[PDB]
Amino acid sequence: ARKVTTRWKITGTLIAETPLHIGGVGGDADTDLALAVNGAGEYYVPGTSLAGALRGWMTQLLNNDESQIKDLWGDHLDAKRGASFVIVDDAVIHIPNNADVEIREGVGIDRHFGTAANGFKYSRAVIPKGSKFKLPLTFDSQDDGLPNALIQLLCALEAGDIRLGAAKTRGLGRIKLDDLKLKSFALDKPEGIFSALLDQGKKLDWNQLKANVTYQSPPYLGISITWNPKDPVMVKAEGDGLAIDILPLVSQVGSDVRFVIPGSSIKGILRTQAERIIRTICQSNGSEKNFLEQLRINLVNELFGSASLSQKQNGKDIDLGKIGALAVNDCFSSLSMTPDQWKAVENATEMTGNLQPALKQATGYPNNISQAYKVLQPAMHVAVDRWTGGAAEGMLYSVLEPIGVTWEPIQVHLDIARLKNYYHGKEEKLKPAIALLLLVLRDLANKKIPVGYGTNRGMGTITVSQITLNGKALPTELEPLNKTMTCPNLTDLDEAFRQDLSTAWKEWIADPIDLCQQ
Amino acid sequence: GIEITITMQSDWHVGTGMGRGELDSVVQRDGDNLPYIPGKTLTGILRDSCEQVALGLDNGQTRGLWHGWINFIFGDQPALAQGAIEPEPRPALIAIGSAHLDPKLKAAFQGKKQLQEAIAFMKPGVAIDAITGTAKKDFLRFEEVVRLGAKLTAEVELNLPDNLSETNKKVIAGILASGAKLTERLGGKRRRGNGRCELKFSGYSDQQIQWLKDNYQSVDQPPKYQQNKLQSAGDNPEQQPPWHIIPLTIKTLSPVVLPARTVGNVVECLDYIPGRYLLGYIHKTLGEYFDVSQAIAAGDLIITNATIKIDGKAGRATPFCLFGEKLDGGLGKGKGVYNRFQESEPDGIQLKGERGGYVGQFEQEQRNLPNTGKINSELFTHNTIQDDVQRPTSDVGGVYSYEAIIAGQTFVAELRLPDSLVKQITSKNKNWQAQLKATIRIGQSKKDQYGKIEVTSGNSADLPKPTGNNKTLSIWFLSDILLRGDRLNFNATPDDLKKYLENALDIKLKERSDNDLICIALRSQRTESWQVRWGLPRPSLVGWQAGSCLIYDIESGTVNAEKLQELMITGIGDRCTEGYGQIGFNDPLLSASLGKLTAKSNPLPTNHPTQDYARLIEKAAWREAIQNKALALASSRAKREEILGIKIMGKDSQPTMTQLGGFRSVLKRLHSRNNRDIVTGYLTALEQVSNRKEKWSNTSQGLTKIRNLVTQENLIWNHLDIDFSPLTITQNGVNQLKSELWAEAVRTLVDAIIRGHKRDLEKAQEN
């Protein structure tokens, strides 16, 4: 057979740090986009999908070097290489107790009218946060020891730097490894070959390998925005309720439900303002374009990403698609409720009756409604008929406004390595993209970007208290970004740095080329 | 007596380059159309795991004492030879069959074409561009994977040497138990999680491995190989008339490869079993009663070819004097067949000569074309892995195909023995024809996936008795005739054949002179074949094909039917003992004029272990049936109105699409029947508000129809109106699956109807 100096079984627990979606073939009558299930109908991570996530990250680590990647993950082309030395099994996903697959609604908002675009309504099934699955790796070493790149991979998993499945830029897919265990079988020797058959192998201390390497995280800029709602902030739930028509969206996070603003929603508001800035500068109208063409404008194609779209642009055939270098996480409330405590709110039927006990429960003031209604407050609204006054027949509706829910800081992750690859390495070309991003954040802090439902109707305006910029391995001319900002107008960034960015930005405004066009 | 049992622990893929429908790659499926593991996959995988074990015991030496043991058990790999090897290659001791699903489960599938598809599902796959992070052009595939939890079992045979010491038997068992336990994966995409398995031998456990662990340091070289030489006695009686004819019926229990020729990388197959393949079974069964090897040398024994059974008898190779209408006739059409030994070509219409296949019986007033038999055959494609790259490569050939006769075909041979040899046997065993029942392996690749056949003996048949017509003598070659020229090479000619019969029968023959009637219709044949005892190919045998015909006018003398009978028994020419030379005189199918004629599951028991696996397959077949039927029912506006009361009236929708959407959002919460409180609660609150109830006026009772569909548990199944009998295999499966899938069927049908409504509403709108 293939000679193997040692077989390493490398195993542990992977946990979903944000909701996952690994897609099947798609569609399931319940949702438009449907989770992969194994032949027993259990949700699982295909080893193809996990193996590609790992091979992908190593390729970004080894600077897209083929030569070393093929020596781990194998090849078909080279006469010397063939089959993969790393083996990745299928792993079933165990969803937390009582928890279940969630459906996330999605909409595309027409950039001209500001309203849902026709046809752009979809829904996605997602594995809730905190679900677990087994890490199922085997490695057949032909040399002695363990490859350092394979050690860096396991360090990256423990750091949670790998994302798996769909919608990776829009909230989903982060996984982190726990309980890593390493079993070595010295298959080259009789004592080792019988160990494989009987003794269940030789333990290695991971901490001893983890001590012999420095984990080289790739360039990124983390942005943490600390904020609180100035007007109630919510994303609307999937459908009308009983006592309350409009209820906030919530998600399972382990034992408790929390209110959630999806990263899809925070990404979408940021993208919209970024585009409006670019189109404003160019005075480029958006009104004659359909929604898929409205989205497709300069710099945002690299930051927020573009749809795959093959084009025979010049007899040469090219793909316009690229992933977003900017990714956004789901933002959850600090407040939490047991799953049944919220089911009592969803199923209240009298706004002054059995709803009042339910909100007193969930808000954590089970005996004090006047404090309960400082957290979640039911509102009633009428449409008033313009000739008669009073109220228009049928037009009475109510909202459960999360007036006082406190929210955790928003995490935006900017992949500087991915942009720099788009610009074929030229870090000069980052400054227009970094300049745009800082202008978007300036508006966020100036209440120019409201979030969630009903922004024009008494909701959605946020106060930003602090933006923390925390990049790793940034190029030296972007190193001034590492800052905590509290002035909305960026005055905490060095004026020489803000003036440098302004210069590269103004030089792009004077000629707004496709900046990744080499 | 040994089996391998395989428990598949993840979804698994095997065997085929072809792809059928919207799937790109499809799994290997057996004769029941059910997925299975081919015996060559199983051997190759198990060998590979035993190779890892031996490679460890040799301390990584790629050649050594323990790789000798692998070559002992699994046979040598010629075509891995790196230098001069003087001994002939050893065959394997271990034969491993194909692994099939549980036979009682396989019976439940019979005819249920929709269920046979549901054993697998599409797995998507995409390849992603590393710099952009988006799917590469071309790099999309959808792949068939069989559901995990399949438990499959294979027959195994260890035909150990007649002398192996008990220490060595324990080593063999030790290695096989060790290699089985080291085996963890098989099939395609192993390295990516497909095809995880448990492979276990019957009667080998950790005790077999533990003995090896305790003793491997003591182990010697394997015993040397030795051929099973023949042994003669010379003691047979002289051959004396009569000749007994014992029909042997062969039935294929697995595909049989009978090499006709290799073209490129595909081995082509015969559509009959040559008699030489049965001499090994004749040696096995009768060589204890008389000297079978002397009987062959004396010609006291004939085993004919096995040809497809028609009319309860051996099918006879189609005579080349038959010609079919080229446009739309011949035996495949069942009309427009002319016997050109007796009929002129009709005016105008051109004919094609018959070229193959077999005909059943025919009688001198048949009034019908003779029954024509066909042999089914299948192409099996294999690969050879180069062990270091673990993929096939040019240095090891890597792709090849066998045509094979598929399973369930039935063939009839005849063993002929002179009376003196039946006396020899019957003096020793009165029941000797009972010993002719056997299961044996014949062909190419006989030791694994291919070649398993049943043999059954019939009762002694009557000797053929041809008509002694003194006007014409006509000869049908029922088998290939090999003649030697007067130089003892095979370059004989049809004039040598005239002299052979002329001399053999004591008659003079001349070609019939009728200008419209063909007298001779031969084709040349060449047989290239190995001989296993020699270890070298046979001398090339040249002759004329079966089906060849010729007819002679008898010039002088008289032909004797006694001698025609004897030649019809013993045949003519070389190697008649293998059934060459078998011939038919004056058969009326050559004599007749033909142009006017025309041709003539049960459920799994409730306690059954696989009942849990069958339930996974059924739900898949039910879900797709419900989805398909829901699509059809939404397509017609009368049915959406029947089922939910919804309708289109001009440009208007009843109710508004918003009202349908509101209902639908609630029905999303109908996960179980005990959630029907949720949906009925919505409807009562709707029904209580006057302005909202009237939104659904001008529907056909829509609110009651929804109330019924949700609260009457029988009603969804009556609207879907699916015959679930072809979709279920578990006993009590129908009532169980109905209760389980109820809420999903309601959600699916309502989802389909509202979609179909909206996209017809768009048409009325856009007028």
Ligand SMILES: [Mg+2]
């Ligand atoms: Mg869909």
Ligand SMILES: [Mg+2]
């Ligand atoms: Mg109400």
Ligand SMILES: [Mg+2]
């Ligand atoms: Mg293509």
Ligand SMILES: [Mg+2]
């Ligand atoms: Mg395809």
